[PDB]
């Protein structure tokens, strides 16, 4: 399973490099990252999991850059999503970058894949990182619904 | 490149085998079969391309089996649409088996992927095999519209 995850991520990287505008490489990366998750993370009071939040400075850098997105930025957001599986805000940014680069079909696939994931594991919508920041903000939640 | 196609197919096969209810492996197979087609086949009179139609006995076998669909049937249909990339009727049948076996998300994904391919190459809607049978039957066409 660990090696399979790696095989899927390498194949996804190759698909994405070759055709940034094609959805399937992006979908395969989501499967690689998420398919192994069958139980939601344990949590204490307030549904706070003992998992580190994304660095808010790292997140502010990506936010800043959305005024002029490029592949470099998009790659960093994607890499962050692969390292931080519950950072759902990253999928919203990623789809926003896709949309701004003219990759409509990829933006849509990114929304759908997060929707599918959350349909399988709905309890994830209620959980937070160790600092009380939500996996899924009310903004990301509304974005997904829309 | 050939080895890339084969790599994609093997990954796709293993994703489908492990999780037959999960869309992404089916999607990966489509990309493998179709991504290298940027031009539609040449044709002569009657929009007949010089490509062999699917064996009618083979198709009669799959249709008869739709009475009691199983994994074996589904695999054969899938193998056939891998070997015969323009046999769109086979996607309809695949999605019908998916539906019947309770895999609705997969059925939907099969429809989406074919509509996507047809959006990229719309002249494929007007072509036929060497005996005049259409790449896209009116039945397949109606299924996509639904």
Author numbering:
A (entry chain C), B (entry chain D): 231 to 376
From the reporting publication:
Contractile bacteriophages of the family Myoviridae (i.e. T4), R-type pyocins and the type VI secretion system (T6SS) of Gram-negative bacteria are evolutionarily related nano-scale injection machines that puncture target cell membranes using a shared contraction mechanism. TssA subunits are enigmatic as they possess a conserved N-terminal region of unknown function, previously identified as ImpA_N (PFAM: PF0681226), whereas sequences located C-terminal to this region are highly divergent. Consistent with this, phylogenetic analysis has suggested that the TssA family can be subdivided into three clades (TssA1, TssA2 and TssA3). The structural studies presented here show that TssA1B, TssA2A and TssA2B possess structurally diverse CTDs that lead to distinct overall architectures for their respective complexes.
